[PDB]
Amino acid sequence: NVEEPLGAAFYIAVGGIASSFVIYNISRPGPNGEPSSLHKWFSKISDYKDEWETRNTLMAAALEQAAHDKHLLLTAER
């Protein structure tokens, strides 16, 4: 008459389904289009309005000049 306990697999699956239902509902933008409190944080931190555009441009121009200086030295008349 040994009894089999439910175990941890049952709780993880039910908890995972319950958590998935809970997390999805609270993450919705709501009836209005205004984002959530936590939605605005993840946009403020990842702003990079032109930061990658600025940094990349200077790097490309600097290395283009650097390639130019070597081209001058490497092709100088003997």
Binding site: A67, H71, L72, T75
Partner: protein, 186 residues
């Protein structure tokens, strides 16, 4: 044109003469007293083999040049093919025949395509700064040059593809191109 037999004889002589050199060193480095006439007795095969490879090589390239009526890298590889084949024939092993032919024909062909500087690379005698700058900034080219190398279709559909597409199909299949309208009202 060129004299295939005359060039081969010069080919046979030049690299056979070095074989005669290597044959004398073997005779000189021979331990037992074999006298001076072992240059052609015990090592005559060595000098003979060299004279054969050099003859086969210069004959065939000259011959390949006559047959193709051209002078390019193909002929030295072909020359090296029989040159390599000749050395393999001395061992009497078919894989040795093919493999040494393959080795020689490949090295001697990439040597002529690339033009190894062992005698000196060709000097451009131009502003070498300018060639690099042109190659560096030639970032946009006329579409015709690309169309010559890559052709039409295979996802490369320049403006005006559909008009010439119908013309090509009419010339080959004799079928007019006219897709049907998908609207009943039209």
């Amino acid at each position: 044109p060129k004299d295939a037999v005359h060039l081969g004889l010069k080919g046979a002589a030049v690299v056979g003469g070095i074989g005669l050199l290597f044959a004398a060193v073997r005779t000189s480095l021979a331990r037992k007293n074999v006298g001076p006439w072992a240059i052609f007795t015990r090592n005559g095969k060595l000098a003979a083999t060299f004279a054969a490879v050099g003859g086969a090589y210069d004959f065939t390239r000259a011959a390949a040049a006559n047959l193709r009526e051209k002078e390019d890298w193909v002929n030295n590889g072909i020359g090296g093919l029989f040159a390599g084949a000749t050395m393999g024939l001395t061992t009497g092993r078919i894989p040795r025949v093919l493999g040494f032919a393959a080795l020689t024909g490949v090295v001697l062909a990439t040597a002529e395509y690339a033009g190894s500087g062992l005698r000196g690379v060709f000097k451009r005698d131009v502003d070498e700064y300018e060639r690099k700058e042109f190659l560096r900034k030639n970032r946009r080219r006329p579409i015709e040059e690309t169309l010559a190398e890559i052709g039409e279709g295979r996802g490369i559909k320049p403006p005006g593809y559909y008009e010439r597409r119908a013309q090509r199909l009419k010339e080959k299949y004799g079928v007019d191109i006219n897709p049907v309208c998908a609207d009943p009202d039209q």
